[PDB]
Amino acid sequence: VIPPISCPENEEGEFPKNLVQIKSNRDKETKVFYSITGQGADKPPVGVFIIERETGWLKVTQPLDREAIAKYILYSHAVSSNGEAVEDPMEIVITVTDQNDNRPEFTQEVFEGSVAEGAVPGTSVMKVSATDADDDVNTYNAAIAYTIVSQDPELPHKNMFTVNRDTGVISVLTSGLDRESYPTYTLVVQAADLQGEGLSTTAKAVITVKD
Ligand SMILES: [Ca+2]
Ligand SMILES: [Ca+2]
Ligand SMILES: [Ca+2]
């Protein structure tokens, strides 16, 4: 039974690239011919994986996209030159491993929040949310750090609010909210993957100051 096969997505270089060479010990008696079935082989996405029919080299023909298909299940077939299957179809599983090629994206372009002017600092005001298509499970490619890029107006302070790096909850950072003077704030919030270090997106948090 065939070992787990793994192919990083977004691969460059010359294609196709060998993945694994499948064999039949059922093939010294007979010349075996290999083929594969499954999505990625004969079924959409067709042609992503091929197998050299005389050698049993399974190859990937193009760069993969983990966010499109992370796991391929293919079946190899070993057929005699005489036209008889010499073995049961062998399942072949190809895991596509993640690259950090999706930038975080906010679920909204503009989040709306409201805070009472007298809200004590540390008061949660609102939440911004971002998603990342990359591999939350096995990488930090989907690990999103939220930040506030800017606040307008910068009054009374540059930093009326703060955002929880992890949760995107925005809180009153300081006192001084004054609905009469500054009815509203526009925060530009950033979501960066790799835990803030990676790829970035921005969104607006419009925060209305209430009585
Ligand atoms: Ca991708
Ligand atoms: Ca990816
Ligand atoms: Ca990412």
UniProtKB/Swiss-Prot annotation:
PTM field: During apoptosis or with calcium influx, cleaved by a membrane-bound metalloproteinase (ADAM10), PS1/gamma-secretase and caspase-3. Processing by the metalloproteinase, induced by calcium influx, causes disruption of cell-cell adhesion and the subsequent release of beta-catenin into the cytoplasm. The residual membrane-tethered cleavage product is rapidly degraded via an intracellular proteolytic pathway. Cleavage by caspase-3 releases the cytoplasmic tail resulting in disintegration of the actin microfilament system.
GO CC list: adherens junction; apical junction complex; apical part of cell; axon; axon terminus; basolateral plasma membrane; catenin complex; cell periphery
GO molecular function: alpha-catenin binding; beta-catenin binding; calcium ion binding; cytoskeletal protein binding; identical protein binding; molecular adaptor activity; protein domain specific binding; protein phosphatase binding
Location (main, coarse): other
Residue stretches making up the Cadherin domain: 1-106, 107-211
Annotated residues for binding of Ca(2+) 3: D132
Paired cysteines (S-S): none
Glycosylation (residues): S124, S129, T202
Subcellular location: Cell junction, Adherens junction; Cell membrane; Endosome; Golgi apparatus, trans-Golgi network
Residues where Ca(2+) 1 binds: D101
Residues that bind Ca(2+) 2: D101
The keyword Flavoprotein appears for this protein: no
Gene Ontology biological process terms from the UniProt entry: actin cytoskeleton organization; bicellular tight junction assembly; calcium-dependent cell-cell adhesion via plasma membrane cell adhesion molecules; canonical Wnt signaling pathway; cell-cell adhesion; cell-cell adhesion mediated by cadherin; cellular response to amino acid stimulus; cochlea development
Keyword list, A-Z: Calcium, Cell adhesion, Cell junction, Cell membrane, Cleavage on pair of basic residues, Cytoplasm, Disulfide bond, Endosome, Glycoprotein, Golgi apparatus, Membrane, Metal-binding, Phosphoprotein, Repeat, Signal, Transmembrane, Transmembrane helix, Ubl conjugation
Effect of Q62E: Increased affinity for L.monocytogenes InlA. Greatly increased affinity
Recorded superkingdom: Eukaryota
Tissues where the protein occurs: Expressed in inner and outer pillar cells of the organ of Corti (at protein level). Expressed in granuloma macrophages (at protein level). Expressed in the epidermal keratinocytes of the skin from birth (at protein level). Expressed in non-neural epithelial tissues.
Subunit record text: Homodimer; disulfide-linked. Component of an E-cadherin/ catenin adhesion complex composed of at least E-cadherin/CDH1, beta-catenin/CTNNB1 or gamma-catenin/JUP, and potentially alpha-catenin/CTNNA1; the complex is located to adherens junctions. Found in a complex composed of CDH1, RAP1A and PKP3; PKP3 acts as a scaffold protein within the complex, the complex is required for CDH1 localization to mature desmosome cell junctions. Interacts with the TRPV4 and CTNNB1 complex. Interacts with CTNND1.
Record function comment: Cadherins are calcium-dependent cell adhesion proteins. They preferentially interact with themselves in a homophilic manner in connecting cells; cadherins may thus contribute to the sorting of heterogeneous cell types. CDH1 is involved in mechanisms regulating cell-cell adhesions, mobility and proliferation of epithelial cells. Promotes organization of radial actin fiber structure and cellular response to contractile forces, via its interaction with AMOTL2 which facilitates anchoring of radial actin fibers to CDH1 junction complexes at the cell membrane.
UniProt free text on domains: Three calcium ions are usually bound at the interface of each cadherin domain and strengthen the connections, imparting a strong curvature to the full-length ectodomain.
Protein name: Cadherin-1
Taxonomic source organism: Mus musculus (Mouse)
Residues of the full protein shown: 159 to 369 of 884
